[PDB]
Structure formats: structure tokens, C-alpha cells
């Protein structure tokens, strides 16, 4: 390469980014560095796309059947001691404010159910938004993910440059 071309007389001065190494200095003397800069790891950045509908569907089906069954059974109980019932249920679901003893307990339990389900939904949304896919794929040479040469994650140096020398000059 370039080092051999320089050693063969085909070159006299190299003005290019060249990492200083002991092996290179043993044959070609170097000058004062322009600036200090190490080597890092480059990984493509992906934007996650996962929106809470695909998270669960069984819970949605269960609540959708539960609202209807509790509404019809409580309306039957009230009649003992339809379109109007479903309209009232939808209105209460929208706003708890309305706009013998069975009505009070019905309102209390339905408001509690709405509060707990909305709290769970908000907590799940917040948790899944703060714990999404992270861009952190490596932290350094000591990162465990870098250690394993698994075929799933393929990574290698471009050529026989100073990275190869640094890898060869490691005890482990």
C-alpha cells in the first residue's frame, strides 16, 4: 500500500489522515499530530414505528362485552325494582356527569372502572413511550454485544489499517 510505496521511494511526504502506530514509527518517523481523535463504532440509526391499538385486543373485546352485559343486567335489575340504555352508557363513558339504590352503586362502580382503565392505559402509554427502541447499540470495546461474534450481527474493519493492529495487540 501507501506505506510500501513510501518505503520504495515512490513517495517523499504523506499528507493524509494516518494513525500513529509503533510498527509504522519503527520504519517511518512521524511528525506532530494535527489533533487527537480515537476510533468509534458506526451503526445505522433507525426510527421505531411501533399507537396503542396493536398492543392488546383481548382486553378491548372483554371491556366491549362487559359494558354491554353490565348495562343490560343493571337495567333489568332497575326495571325489576335497549337503545336508551346504550345511549346512557355511551354518555356516561364520554362524561361521567349525567346530561333506587342501584343507580348510586352503578355510578360508583362504573366511575371506578373508567378511572382504573384510563389510568392503566395512560401508564402503559407512558411506559412504552419512555422504554421504546433505544439507539444505544454499543458503548465501547468492553460492551458485551461487541464481544460475541454472532452471525446475526456482522461487523468488521474495512482493511488492514491501525484498527487491525490494535486488535492484534490485545492480550485477550
Amino acid at each position: 500500500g501507501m506505506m510500501g510505496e513510501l518505503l520504495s521511494g515512490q513517495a517523499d511526504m504523506i499528507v493524509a489522515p494516518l494513525t500513529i502506530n509503533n510498527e509504522r514509527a519503527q520504519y517511518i518517523e512521524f511528525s506532530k499530530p494535527f489533533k487527537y481523535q480515537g476510533l468509534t463504532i458506526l451503526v445505522k440509526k433507525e426510527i421505531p414505528r411501533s399507537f396503542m391499538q396493536p398492543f392488546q385486543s383481548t382486553l378491548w373485546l372483554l371491556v366491549g362485552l362487559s359494558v354491554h352485559v353490565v348495562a343490560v343486567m343493571l337495567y333489568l335489575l332497575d326495571r325489576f325494582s335497549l337503545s336508551s340504555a346504550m345511549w346512557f352508557s355511551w354518555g356516561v363513558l364520554l362524561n361521567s356527569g349525567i346530561g333506587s339504590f342501584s343507580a348510586r352503586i352503578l355510578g360508583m362502580v362504573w366511575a371506578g372502572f373508567a378511572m382504573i382503565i384510563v389510568a392503566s392505559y395512560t401508564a402503559n402509554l407512558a411506559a412504552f413511550l419512555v422504554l421504546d427502541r433505544p439507539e444505544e447499540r454499543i458503548t465501547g470495546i468492553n460492551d458485551p454485544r461487541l464481544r460475541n461474534p454472532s452471525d446475526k450481527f456482522i461487523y468488521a474493519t474495512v482493511k488492514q489499517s491501525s484498527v487491525d493492529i490494535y486488535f492484534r495487540r490485545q492480550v485477550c
Binding site: 382486553l59 339504590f101 372502572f113 392503566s120 402503559n124
Partner: peptide, 25 residues
């Protein structure tokens, strides 16, 4: 979550108990 299912089903027992109480009374 399994914990959320148990938490939301805990109040169903109380609701049905209250419904039975107000039906029998």
C-alpha cells in the same frame, strides 16, 4: 399485563356483590 387483568377483575366481584345485594333488597 396479567397484573392489570387481576386488578380490573377485583372490582367486578364487588360490583356483582352490590348488584346482588340491591336485587335481594
Amino acid at each position: 399485563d396479567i397484573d392489570n387483568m387481576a386488578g380490573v377483575f377485583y372490582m367486578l366481584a364487588a360490583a356483582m356483590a352490590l348488584s346482588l345485594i340491591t336485587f335481594i333488597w
